Design a protein around this ligand. Structure first.
Ligand SMILES: Cc1cn([C@H]2C[C@H](OP(=O)(O)O)[C@@H](COP(=O)(O)O)O2)c(=O)[nH]c1=O
Ligand SMILES: [Ca+2]
Length: 129
């Protein structure tokens, strides 16, 4: 897998971020995670956590996995990095996302994220509290 440039356009919610990628606006849906909707418990905290992380970064990158790069809604499917730190893993490590939507061939970082979820759950963080 390879990191590619993108620039933030807008943080949308805990697991959706609009970016400019190869010069075009695209909504990205973060691989392998599920954050609560804004209207559910922890939904506002997940949205806030992703927002701060992408807005504060000097460098945003996207990393596609080995399979499909867009979902049925036209959203990009990628891992998102903010100053080299993976937002997907960070949300899971903080108990603000569950590992979810693990489809074969887009699951390179599955075990990394499950490990983060185990530790969030051991700490009883947020969703796991
Ligand atoms: C994360 C992800 C979601 N999706 C689709 C599955 C779900 O379809 P349905 O909309 O039919 O439930 C939806 C979940 O996204 P959200 O969690 O953003 O709603 O996005 C993919 O197809 N591949 C993916 O990797
Ligand atoms: Ca969601």
């Amino acid at each position: 897998l390879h990191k590619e440039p993108a620039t933030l356009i807008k943080a949308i919610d805990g697991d959706t971020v609009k970016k400019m990628y190869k010069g075009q606006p695209m909504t990205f849906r973060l691989l392998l995670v599920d954050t609560p909707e804004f209207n559910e418990k922890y939904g506002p905290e997940a949205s806030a956590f992703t927002k701060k992380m992408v807005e504060n970064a000097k460098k945003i990158e996207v990393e596609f996995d080995k399979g499909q790069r867009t979902d049925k809604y036209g959203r990009g499917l990628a891992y998102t990095y903010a100053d080299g730190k993976m937002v997907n893993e960070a949300l899971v490590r903080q108990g603000l996302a569950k590992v979810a939507y693990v489809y074969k061939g887009n699951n390179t970082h599955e075990q990394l994220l499950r490990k983060a979820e185990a530790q969030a759950k051991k700490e009883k963080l947020n969703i796991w509290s």
